RNA sequence: GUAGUUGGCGGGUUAAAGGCCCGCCAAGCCGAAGACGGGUAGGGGCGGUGAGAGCCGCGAGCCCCGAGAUGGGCACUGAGACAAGGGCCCAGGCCCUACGGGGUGCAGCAGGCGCGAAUACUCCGCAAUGCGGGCAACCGCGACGGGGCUACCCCGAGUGCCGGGCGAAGAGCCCGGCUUUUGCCCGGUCUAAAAAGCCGGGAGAAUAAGCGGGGGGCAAGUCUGGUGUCAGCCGCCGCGGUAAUACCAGCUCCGCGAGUGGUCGGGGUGUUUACUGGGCUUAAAGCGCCCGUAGCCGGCCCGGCAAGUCGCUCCUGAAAUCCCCGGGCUCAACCCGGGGGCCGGGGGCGAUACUGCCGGGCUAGGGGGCGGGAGAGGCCGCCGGUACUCCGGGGGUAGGGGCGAAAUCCGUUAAUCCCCGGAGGACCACCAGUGGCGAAAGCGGGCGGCCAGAACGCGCCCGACGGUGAGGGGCGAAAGCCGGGGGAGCAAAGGGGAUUAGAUACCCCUGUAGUCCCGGCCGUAAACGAUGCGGGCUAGCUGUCGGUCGGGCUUAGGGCCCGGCCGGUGGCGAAGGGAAACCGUUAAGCCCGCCGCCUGGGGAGUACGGCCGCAAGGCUGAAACUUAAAGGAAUUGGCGGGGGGGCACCACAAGGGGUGAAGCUU
RNA sequence: GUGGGGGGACGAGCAGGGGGCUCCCAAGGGGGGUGAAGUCGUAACAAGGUAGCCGUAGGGGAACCUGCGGCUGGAUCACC
């Protein structure tokens, strides 16, 4: 039984990137998936994102730019604080200048850089590098 | 170590097999893992010059299958100990 | 064969219970929790004990080695148990006499069990009548 | 088994010939470190 | 499990609420989210260890709370005790006595005995810090303060410096010079007084280094003597049995040093407890299979809340301890001053992405359907196929049967073989397949009836109804057990004939349970894919099975061929994975859930307890002790009463001469 | 202020059973296991000389043998 669409979509993207495909189709989807893809595209890891209106909830076709070295959804969705962002940073990312964590906050889903800029915390979602 | 991917018998997706009795034997195994070698068989071979086309003498031939366990199949030379590379070769067992 | 097991965000107590269940597979944890050392050890958890020497004995070294390691039989004062204690050092047995009070001490070796080629000896003599056998052997002291 | 016995205890120690040894006093830590520096770092 | 137990009502008592206690009334209360029972333990601040998560309690000493004063009870006074140096009683000790009586229990500060591996002076002062009393001055205080003893923890130093010679560049000795920390003596200061400390003065190189080790790990000797698998070393690996770098000694070197070692316990070690972060095909490890309770985990969209979550703020989380900063002791250790933390509780104000709750709406997962097919799926009934055994009769003599060889055995009351009839029990040959069905066990003749479960096709219905599942269940080969029926063939046990040194086996003849059916029990298996169940993603090529769609043909058939999808079932094999064998869209890959199991070997699937069983037994399941490996996959060889090939008068075949017997030489 | 009898709550102690959890002691066993190699065979490893192993039942100086079903971890990855 399908449980987490976010982890499903992220691992599908990782499998397509490992196979060196140009585009990955993501079904089922939700707004969390859309905002995560938006953050990835903003940081350049994911290319163009096309919506498809099939009757069964919608699909996302994502273009891959050869930029991902490893992707994945942090599960469980740990509540993290602004002072606690840095240890999760070192836990999931290589190098202090490489990669980003994705966080869901009360002002919306953003990267760990934007969360540290806003001086907020939230729920960890995924990592990219 | 697991010799063969077959388990030594091409049994198929089932739990138990009907199983048969060995000839010259009775150790035997199920329907798979047994040898079923077939021979042409006819009574009184090459008398067809002195019979058949003499008198009226109409003879009959009867294809006959013999079932052997692994021990007898090795014993009468119907099975050899092939090398590891040749273990996966598909050859017929001399009819 | 997939996904540890209780990984949920509200599976903390279940994960703790599951991890606590499998600590009893560890011999060290079970021994420490059940107090087997303080039940079955002749020393009863002490680093050393006292005893009275009863007879002098010689154990045979293990198969590849050829030797008669010389020990004594010591009866512990606090429990009364009689145990074989190795007497180390060349000529160390000659400083030991029957009915002599001795200080019995763990022989070393892996996990407090027997040493290298001596079979089934867990203790050794450190003191004889209040004077250390090392000092007696080295001549720094004389046995009283 | 072995040809050892309890009657043979201390045999080699009692049998070795006694050679008197020279008196010796060890160094203090500063002098020892001086000696090691002199003999190892130097010639 | 509980029976004043849980609650209610009315009272008593109390300083005060309360089953605190009492009278009546009801059956309630706790429990697998683990009652009850047992075990261990005073709780906290805190401490050790690790880079950290974490683990441990050395959770002894210091501070806060608790309890106790030989065990068990009960009271007086008083604001306060059911009172450690106050009282009364029982118990159990002990001391004094003039025998009538009295006192006493150090878990107060010293001190003694005892126990144990294991331990301080029967010292000095109320000067500091405080307290009780007093208007006060003052008084008292084994609190507290001070020293003593003690390898208690941390800090700073000495056991000489300089040059020369001999020595080896070393140690050490000698020579010439310098210094006095330190040790010793004196004064001041200090001290409640002392001691010590500090200042100053005197002689003086003068007073001061050990512990462990040198075969690898692991820094340091293949130098010398002794011993000779003895004595001894040895955490592990390993030395020693004549030439020992490993033992005993000398010399010499190494490590740390006022310390250095031995044994224990904790942490590291250890990704061997795995949240970070392990593994379960074969190394230990998937329950034999399935149903499902709690729990954990759960589709999409919209609206409300703001519980989790996040931000800020406040009241807090005693002090000491810990981290940072400044300052003061000669620096230091340490003390003083400021900030932080001390992982938490609560209040206020905010945010709404995610989780949760509430409401409405969906169809993607799930369930229920309709249609044509597929299937050894099941239960029940009826029927057949040959084979077989036996029986009756007819033919025809004398053998048959068995084996490597036989023999037991069957046969002259006619056997084996052939024919004509009857009876009985099992099985369902070929077709037939890594073919099908089923959760597993398992299911193979035909027809019929009654059921079940899937796949395929679908603009059918409901609208998340789902996953997994501790505990709890139900099904579950063979053998076996209980009772009844049946019994052809086979056949444990048993009998006999052989073989062998033996043969209580392997071969032959025979033979009973059993195998079959009915009802029940058993509940195990190499119950295996040694591979838990659910879902998603990730090259392909190829055989086959079911359905379906497109084209072609047509044994005009429910048929055949090619191509696509869906769903099974095999083979090879991308990426990836693995110790490797190997897995590889039927994963052992990349992920998301939940359950079960593993933590070196032996002891040991043992002992005890419990439960289950008619019994056999089954399930669950240790420790003591012992051990340094047990183990997996693969490589080379060696070997084989496995296979294949080649060769040889130190092999054979075809031959010739011989030796082995006599006498003699050797 | 008292001295008798009785009732009441608390409640030691001594008499006793009841149970449990512990711990020792015992003539004798009872299955076991470690040594060092002593006897008897040769059960496993090679188609280990009767292929092996699993459960079960019977039998036997003993390793073990036999019956039934199962597995290959077989010495067969292979009919026509
Ligand atoms: Mg099976
Ligand atoms: Mg050992
Ligand atoms: Mg009241
Ligand atoms: Mg009560
Ligand atoms: Mg570490
Ligand atoms: Mg104290
Ligand atoms: Mg008392
Ligand atoms: Mg009192
Ligand atoms: Mg006392
Ligand atoms: Mg005292
Ligand atoms: Mg005062
Ligand atoms: Mg020091
Ligand atoms: Mg010189
Ligand atoms: Mg003075
Ligand atoms: Mg030394
Ligand atoms: Mg030496
Ligand atoms: Mg070295
Ligand atoms: Mg050594
Ligand atoms: Mg491991
Ligand atoms: Mg295994
Ligand atoms: Mg299974
Ligand atoms: Mg089991
Ligand atoms: Mg099993
Ligand atoms: Mg909130
Ligand atoms: Mg401070
Ligand atoms: Mg605190
Ligand atoms: Mg504090
Ligand atoms: Mg289930
Ligand atoms: Mg269960
Ligand atoms: Mg049966
Ligand atoms: Mg019969
Ligand atoms: Mg028979
Ligand atoms: Mg298994
Ligand atoms: Mg593995
Ligand atoms: Mg493969
Ligand atoms: Mg078990
Ligand atoms: Mg039992
Ligand atoms: Mg080879
Ligand atoms: Mg010849
Ligand atoms: Mg001759
Ligand atoms: Mg054998
Ligand atoms: Mg055999
Ligand atoms: Mg038998
Ligand atoms: Mg027989
Ligand atoms: Zn056979």
Swiss-Prot record, chain A:
Name used for this protein in its record: Small ribosomal subunit protein uS8
Residue ranges that the Swiss-Prot or TrEMBL entry lists as coiled coil: none
Its biological purpose: One of the primary rRNA binding proteins, it binds directly to 16S rRNA central domain where it helps coordinate assembly of the platform of the 30S subunit.
Pfam families for the chain: Ribosomal_S8
GO biological process, one term: translation
Domain of life per record: Archaea
Subunit structure: Part of the 30S ribosomal subunit.
Source species of the chain: Pyrobaculum calidifontis (strain DSM 21063 / JCM 11548 / VA1)
SUPFAM superfamilies: Ribosomal protein S8 (SSF56047)
CC per GO annotation: ribonucleoprotein complex; ribosome
UniProt keyword terms in alphabetical order: Ribonucleoprotein, Ribosomal protein, RNA-binding, rRNA-binding
Alphabetized Gene3D superfamilies for the sequence: 3.30.1370.30, 3.30.1490.10
InterPro entries noted in UniProt: Ribosomal_uS8, Ribosomal_uS8_CS, Ribosomal_uS8_sf
Annotated GO MF terms: rRNA binding; structural constituent of ribosome
Similarity-based family: Belongs to the universal ribosomal protein uS8 family.
From Swiss-Prot, chain C:
Family: Belongs to the universal ribosomal protein uS12 family.
NCBIfam families: PRK04211.1 (NF003254), uS12_E_A (TIGR00982)
SUPFAM superfamilies per record: Nucleic acid-binding proteins
Name this polypeptide is given: Small ribosomal subunit protein uS12
Keyword check for Magnesium: no
Pfam families found in the cross-reference section: Ribosom_S12_S23
Annotated function: With S4 and S5 plays an important role in translational accuracy. Located at the interface of the 30S and 50S subunits.
InterPro entries noted in UniProt: NA-bd_OB-fold (IPR012340), Ribosomal_uS12 (IPR006032), Ribosomal_uS12_arc (IPR022863), Ribosomal_uS12_euk/arc (IPR005680)
Keyword Lipid biosynthesis: no
Span of the signal peptide: none
Keyword terms of this UniProt record: Ribonucleoprotein, Ribosomal protein, RNA-binding, rRNA-binding
GO biological process terms held by the UniProt record: translation
Organism: Pyrobaculum calidifontis (strain DSM 21063 / JCM 11548 / VA1)
GO molecular function: rRNA binding; structural constituent of ribosome
Top-level taxonomic group: Archaea
Subunit-level organization: Part of the 30S ribosomal subunit.
């Amino acid at each position: 039984v399908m449980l987490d669409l976010l982890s499903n979509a992220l691992t599908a993207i990782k499998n397509a990137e490992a196979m060196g495909k140009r585009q990955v189709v993501i079904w089922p989807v939700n707004k969390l998936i859309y905002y995560t893809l938006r953050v990835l595209q903003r940081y350049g890891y994911v290319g163009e994102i096309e919506y498809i209106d099939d009757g069964r909830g919608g699909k996302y076709v994502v273009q891959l730019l050869g930029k991902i070295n490893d992707i994945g959804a942090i599960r469980p969705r740990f509540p993290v604080k602004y002072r606690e962002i840095v240890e999760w940073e070192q836990k999931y990312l290589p190098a202090r200048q490489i990669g980003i964590l994705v966080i869901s906050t009360s002002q919306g889903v953003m990267s760990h850089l934007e969360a540290k800029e806003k001086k907020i915390g939230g729920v960890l979602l995924a990592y990219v590098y | 170590p697991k010799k063969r991917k077959n388990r030594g018998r091409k049994k198929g997706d089932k739990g138990r097999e009907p199983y048969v009795y060995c000839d010259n034997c009775g150790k035997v195994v199920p329907r798979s893992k047994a040898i079923r070698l077939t021979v042409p068989y006819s009574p009184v071979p090459p008398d067809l010059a002195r019979e058949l086309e003499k008198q009226g003498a109409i003879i009959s031939r009867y294809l006959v299958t013999k079932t052997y366990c692994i021990n007898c199949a090795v014993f009468f030379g119907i099975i050899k100990v092939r090398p590891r590379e040749e273990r996966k070769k598909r050859v017929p067992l001399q009819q | 064969p997939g996904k540890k097991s209780p990984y949920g965000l509200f599976a903390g107590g279940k994960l703790k219970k599951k991890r606590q269940k499998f600590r009893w597979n560890d011999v060290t944890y079970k021994r420490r929790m059940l107090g087997l050392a303080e039940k079955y050890d002749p020393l009863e958890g002490a680093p050393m004990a006292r005893g009275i020497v009863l007879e002098k004995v010689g154990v045979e070294a293990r198969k590849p080695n050829a030797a008669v390691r010389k020990c004594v039989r010591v009866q512990l004062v606090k429990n009364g148990k009689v145990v074989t204690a190795f007497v180390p050092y060349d000529g160390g047995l000659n400083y030991i006499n029957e009915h002599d009070e001795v200080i019995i001490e763990r022989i070393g070796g892996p996990e407090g069990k027997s040493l290298g080629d001596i079979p089934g000896v867990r203790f050794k003599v450190v003191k004889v009548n209040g004077v250390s056998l090392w000092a007696i052997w080295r001549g720094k002291k004389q046995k009283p | 088994p072995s040809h050892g016995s309890l009657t043979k205890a201390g045999k080699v120690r009692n049998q070795t010939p006694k050679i008197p040894a020279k008196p010796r006093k060890n160094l203090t830590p500063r002098r020892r470190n001086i000696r090691n520096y002199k003999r190892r770092v130097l010639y």
